[PDB]
Chains A and B, each alone.
Chain A
Amino acid sequence: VELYRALDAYRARIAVEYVLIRAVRDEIYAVLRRDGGALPQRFACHVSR
């Protein structure tokens, strides 16, 4: 049981960057839903109709 605890603690340690990336994913999808999919320009670039 002690080594099982060590394994699950190691799993908890290793996942920091991946849960941060998943949080970024979920935020991206949430704001894409919130704005109705209409995305305004924030970086200057010429466009064509």
Chain B
Amino acid sequence: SVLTQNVLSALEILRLVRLDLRQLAQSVQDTIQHMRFLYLL
């Protein structure tokens, strides 16, 4: 007691990368509407 295999494990993390991209887009939109709702007169 070779790259095509590891690229799939990399894609398994790239999925979480996509999720974080979605969360940051939602954060930016939330900030924009919040600022429009409050600060603008």
Contact = CB atoms under 8 A, between A and B. Distances in A.
A1 B37 CA distance: 8
Contacts of B38: 3-4, 7
Interface residues of B, number: 2
A27 B16 CA distance: 68
Contacts of B37: 1, 4
Interface string A1-36: 101100100000000000000000000000000000
A15 B37 CA distance: 22
A4 B40 CA distance: 11
Interface string B14-40: 000000000000000000000001100
Interface of B: 37-38
